[PDB]
Amino acid sequence: LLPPTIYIPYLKMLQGLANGPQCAHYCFSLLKVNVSWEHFFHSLMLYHEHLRKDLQKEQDGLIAFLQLTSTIITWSENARLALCETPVVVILGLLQCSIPLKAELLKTLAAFGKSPEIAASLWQSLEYTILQTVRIPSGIEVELNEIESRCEEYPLTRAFCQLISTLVESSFPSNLGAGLRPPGFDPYLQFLRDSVFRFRTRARA
């Protein structure tokens, strides 16, 4: 069933079905072997182009698409890399667009992040995706601004935190941000000053 609304509920229903580590595996196979994962990313890619070229129905569909990818990627193993490489590139592109959604893709991206060394593609995406627009003077504040400009809303931040929590778990590239800015991990922690400084003054416990 193709109708956009049926299609989105289908995605949601399957997410529910994906529950066990075991079920999640089947859901992985369902798309991979006997709609394919590729079709799914394609849809996301297409929406991305339409969104940017343009500059509720879509939110329904996209939100569902993400809800599903998230559910499985979380409950999976070596398979995670396979989905990772593939939604990773597309998801990154989607994040660049404004979207309401930003947070959600960040949550999914995080699920994709692997335990090992091959974090690097992800860190580059994140740094590039904060760094790109911002103009950084030689001081600290300008760096904070880069993050603040991009991570405008609450969902954006929570998603960002989940992704960061995952990447920071155990590793990252040397001389990160080289070329564009003063390198290193430090500015990210500064950003948290913006966050947990503020937290005390939340809304909404």
Place this chain on the structure above:
Amino acid sequence: EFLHELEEKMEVARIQLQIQETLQRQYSHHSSVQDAVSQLDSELMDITKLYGEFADPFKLAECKLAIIHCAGYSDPILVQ
């Protein structure tokens, strides 16, 4: 509030004095374009007017910086 207006005035006036002083030193200037000094001494000017007209064209970066201080323009990129 009278005080408020007075102090702001003193600040802006001071800037013109500085700009005026630099104009003398600057060798890019022509004596006949005395008109600028007449304008400077003559009255208080709009900050944007001071900034756009004077600071940028005469590249007085310091003045521009000070002016933006008074304005209280925060934008880090522009400031940097």
